[PDB]
Amino acid sequence: PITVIVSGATGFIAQHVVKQLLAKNYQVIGTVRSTAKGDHLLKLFNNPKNLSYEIVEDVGTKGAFDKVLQKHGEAKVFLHLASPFHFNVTDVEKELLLPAVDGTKNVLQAIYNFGNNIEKVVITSSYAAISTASKEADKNAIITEKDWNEISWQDALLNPVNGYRGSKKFAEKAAWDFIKSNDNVKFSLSTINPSFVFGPQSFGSEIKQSLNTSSEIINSILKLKPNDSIPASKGGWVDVRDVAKAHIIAFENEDAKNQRILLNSGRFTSQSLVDIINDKFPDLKGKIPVDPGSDKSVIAESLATIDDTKSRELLGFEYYNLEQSVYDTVEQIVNAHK
Ligand SMILES: NC(=O)C1=CN([C@@H]2O[C@H](COP(=O)(O)OP(=O)(O)OC[C@H]3O[C@@H](n4cnc5c(N)ncnc54)[C@H](OP(=O)(O)O)[C@@H]3O)[C@@H](O)[C@H]2O)C=CC1
C-alpha cells in the first residue's frame, strides 16, 4: 500500500509517470479535466485495481485540489504536472502568467491545508526556468541547477515565447517562495526542470497528426518536403521516459528533498533530427531535406554547456540517447498512420 496523486494525468509526461508508477505497484489517483478524460485513462490501462481518477477541471483556481485531498487522506506523494503548454495568447499576463503563479499557489495552499499525510511533492518546471537568454548562447558558459533565468516580468510579456519561459520561471519561483513563507511545511519539495522533451507517447493509440508535445519539433520535420528549407531550432533535449522516471526518483530518493533537478540528455539542432531520420528510416529518405553534420559545429559554437552532473548523480540511471529517442518517436508515428 502506498498512494500517489498525479495531476493532469492524461498528459504526455504524466501518462508515462503513471505507467511507471503503476508498474512499481503504487496506488495512483490521477486528476483530469473531464469525465471523458478519466474513463479514457482507465481503459488505456485496462482498469487496474490500483488506479483511480478524480476531476479537477482547472488546476489553477482557488481550492482546485480541495475535495480530492480531503477525500483521500491516505496519500503521501503529490506529483504536479498540469500547466498550459500553449494557447493562442492574446494577452500574456491574463492568459498565461498570473495563471501559472496564482495557480501554483492554489495547489500548495490546497496541500498545506488538507494534504495531511503528504510527505514528498514534485512539481514539473522547465530548463527555461534555469537558463538565461544571454547565458544559454555563450559557448564558454556553464549553466547548472543553481542558475535562474533572470527574465523580468516586463520582459515575459513581450511575446508568447517569453511568456512561456516567464511562466516557468515565476511559477517555480512561487513554489519555493511558498515553502519559505510558511512554517510547519509538512512536506518536502523537489522539482524537475527538463529541456525539450522528445520520445514516444505512452500509447501509440494517442498519436494524432500534430502532437500536443514538443515532439512537434520532430513531427514538423516529417511534414517538410524535399525542396523545403529546414526550419532552424536548437537547444537541449531529453527523453519523456527518463523525465517520467526522474519524477519517481524525486520522491523515492531522499537526497532529492529540496532539489532542482535538471533533465537533459544532450543537444540538438534540426539538422540532427533530419540526419537521424534519413539515416534510420529508408522509406523516408528522399521525401524530406538534407545538409548533414551541421549540428556538431552549430552546437559547439552557439550553446553553453549544460552541466547536470549533480542531477545525473542523484538520479543514477542512464538516459536514452538522441538516435534512440528520435527513432522511437518517429517509428511510433509511422506505425500509427495506416
Ligand atoms: N514538454 C516539454 O518539452 C517541456 C515541458 N515542460 C513542462 O512539462 C510539463 C508537462 O507538460 P507535457 O506533459 O510535457 O505535455 P502536455 O502539454 O501533454 O501536458 C499537458 C497536460 O496538462 C493538462 N493541463 C494544463 N493546464 C491545465 C489546467 N489549467 N487545468 C487542468 N489541466 C491542465 C492537460 O490536460 P488536457 O490534456 O485534459 O487538456 C494535459 O493533460 C508542463 O507543466 C511544462 O511546464 C518544460 C519544459 C519543456
Do 311 and 262 touch, CB atoms closer than 8 A? yes
Q: Are residues 278 and 50 in contact, defined by beta-carbon separation less than 8 angstroms?
A: no
Atom of ligand 1 nearest to the CA of 215: 3
Question: What are the backbone angles phi and psi of residue 276, rounded to the nearest 5°?
Answer: -60, -45
Alpha-carbon separation of residue 200 from 38, 96, 269, 323 (angstroms): 21, 27, 19, 13
Distance (angstroms) between ligand 1 centre and the Cα of 212 equals: 9
CA of 43 to the centre of ligand 1 (A): 21
Number of domains in the chain: 1
Q: Is the shortest distance between the CB of 244 and ligand 1 below 6 Å?
A: no
Pocket test for ligand 1, best of 18, 31, 83, 107 (most atoms within 8 A of CB): 83
Asked if residue 69 belongs to a known ligand binding site, the reply is no
Q: What's the residue count for the chain?
A: 338
C-alpha cell at 113: 491545508
Ligand 1 lined by 17 (C-beta under 6 Å): no
Experimental method: X-ray
- Choose among 101, 116, 124, 121: nearest CA to 184: 116
**Would you say 262 and 127 are in contact if contact means Cβ atoms under 8 Å apart?**
yes
Q: Does the annotation place 168 within a ligand binding site?
A: yes
Look up the domain containing 129 and give its range: 1-338
Q: Which of 35, 37, 81 to mutate to test the pocket of ligand 1 (most atoms within 8 A of CB)?
A: 81
Q: Are 247 and 259 in contact (CB under 8 A)?
A: no
**How far is it, in rounded angstroms, from Cα 195 to Cα 208?**
23
Which residue's CA is the closest to the ligand 1 atom numbered 10? 81
Distances (CA, A) of 197 to 252, 261, 326: 22, 14, 11
Ligand 1 contacts CB of residue 38 (under 6 A): no
- Taking the C-alpha atoms of residue 147 and residue 103, their distance in angstroms, rounded to an integer, is 24
| 127 contact partners, CB below 8 Å, separation of at least 6 | 193, 194, 195, 236, 262, 263, 264, 306
> Which ligand 1 atom sits nearest the alpha carbon of residue 171?
45
- The Cα 210–Cα 223 span in angstroms is 10
Q: Is residue 263 within 6 Å of ligand 1 at its C-beta?
A: no
Q: Give the whole-angstrom CA distance, residue 267 versus residue 297.
A: 12
How many whole angstroms from 80 Cα to the centroid of ligand 1?
10
- 3-state secondary structure labels for all residues of the chain: CCEEEECCCCCHHHHHHHHHHHHCCCEEEEEECCHHHHHHHHHHCCCCCCEEEEECCCCCCCCCCHHHHHHCCCCCEEEECCCCCCCCCCCHHHHHHHHHHHHHHHHHHHHHHHCCCCCEEEEECCHHHCCCHHHHCCCCCEECCCCCCCCCHHHHCCCHHHHHHHHHHHHHHHHHHHHHCCCCCCCEEEEEEECEEECCCCCHHHCCCCCCCCCHHHHHHHCCCCCCCCCCCEEEEEEHHHHHHHHHHHHHCCCCCCCEEEECCEEEEHHHHHHHHHHHCCCCCCCCCCCCCHHHHHHHHHCCEECCHHHHHHHCCCCCCHHHHHHHHHHHHHCCCC
277 known member of a binding site = no
Residue 279 makes CB contacts below 8 A (sequence gap 6+) with: none
Q: Measuring CA to CA, which residue among 245, 243, 262 is closest to residue 253?
A: 245
**Where do we find the cell 503548454?**
85
- Going by C-alpha positions, the residue among 241, 11, 3, 8 that lies closest to residue 120 is 3
* Residue in the structure block whose three cell numbers are 521516459: 241
Distance from the Cα of residue 128 to its chain's centroid: 11
Ligand 1 touching residue 82 (CB < 6 A): yes
The strand pairing partners of 311, in sequence order, are: none
Strands 3-6 and 234-239 turn out to be unpaired
Q: What is the CA radius of gyration of the chain?
A: 20
Q: How far is residue 98's CA from residue 93's CA, in Å, rounded to a whole number?
A: 6
* Residue 78 near ligand 1, beta carbon < 6 Å: no
Documented resolution in Å = 3.0
